[PDB]
Copies of this chain bind each other. A is one copy, B any other.
Amino acid sequence: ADVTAQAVATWSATAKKDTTSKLVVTPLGSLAFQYAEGIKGFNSQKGLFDVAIEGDSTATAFKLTSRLITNTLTQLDTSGSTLNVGVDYNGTAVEKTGDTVMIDTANGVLGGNLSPLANGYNASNRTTAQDGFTFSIISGTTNGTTAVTDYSTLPEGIWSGDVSVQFDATWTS
């Protein structure tokens, strides 16, 4: 039978619209979105991750996929306003409804920066690699229900929440 493993990677995220910037404090690695009056929208953020796997010495193929679990940021006050964070892996969406292929040795995918996993999955020891996702704001609500993509219509304030991505590894023999 296949060997399978799962891990969930969670980033904390904040977004700000029209708030004071007299004091800004940012944990390293955190996803920080800022509404820009300039372009009427939010910046994107690259968020990096480290992966480690244990080798399966008799495996003959390896697959690594990702799937979005949570992505909702909510304002800190009484507004109920939310933002949803889109996640991209090398130009391909990582969504809640499917598994985005990152490595698939059988079908001709190495995973780019994740290539060490594609080469080490059937070593007898552990293999490590580092890559990232691009995170962006893909929708929002004024109040938790009324959805928008015109972000100029959002109430001012701060949103926060966790963005969690599930990773699924499969070793085949």
- The answer to whether B24 and A7 touch across the interface, beta carbons within 8 angstroms, is yes
- How many subunits of this chain does the assembly comprise? 2
B-facing mask of A5-44, CB < 8 A → 1, else 0? 1111111101000001111111111100000000000000
> How many A residues, CB 8 Å from partner?
37
Given contacts A11-B12, A12-B12, contact A51 B27 (CB under 8 A): no
Q: Would you call A99 an interface residue if the criterion is a C-beta within 8 Å of the partner chain's C-beta atoms?
A: no
User: A158's closest neighbor in chain B, by CB?
Assistant: B8
Which residues from B are CB-within-8-Å of A8?
Answer: 14, 25, 76, 158, 160
- The answer to whether B10 and A14 touch across the interface, beta carbons within 8 angstroms, is yes
Which residues from B are CB-within-8-Å of A28?
Answer: 28-29, 47-50, 130
> Which chain A residues (47-105) contact chain B, with CB distance < 8 Å?
47-54, 56, 76
| Residues of A contacting B: mostly | strand
- The answer to whether A26 and B14 touch across the interface, beta carbons within 8 angstroms, is no
Q: Would you call A156 an interface residue if the criterion is a C-beta within 8 Å of the partner chain's C-beta atoms?
A: no
Which residues from B are CB-within-8-Å of A147?
Answer: none
Q: Could you tell me the distance between the alpha carbons of A160 and B8 in the complex, rounded to whole angstroms?
A: 10
Which residues from B are CB-within-8-Å of A162?
Answer: 12, 162
- The answer to whether B20 and A5 touch across the interface, beta carbons within 8 angstroms, is yes
User: A76's closest neighbor in chain B, by CB?
Assistant: B8
Which residues from B are CB-within-8-Å of A21?
Answer: 52, 54
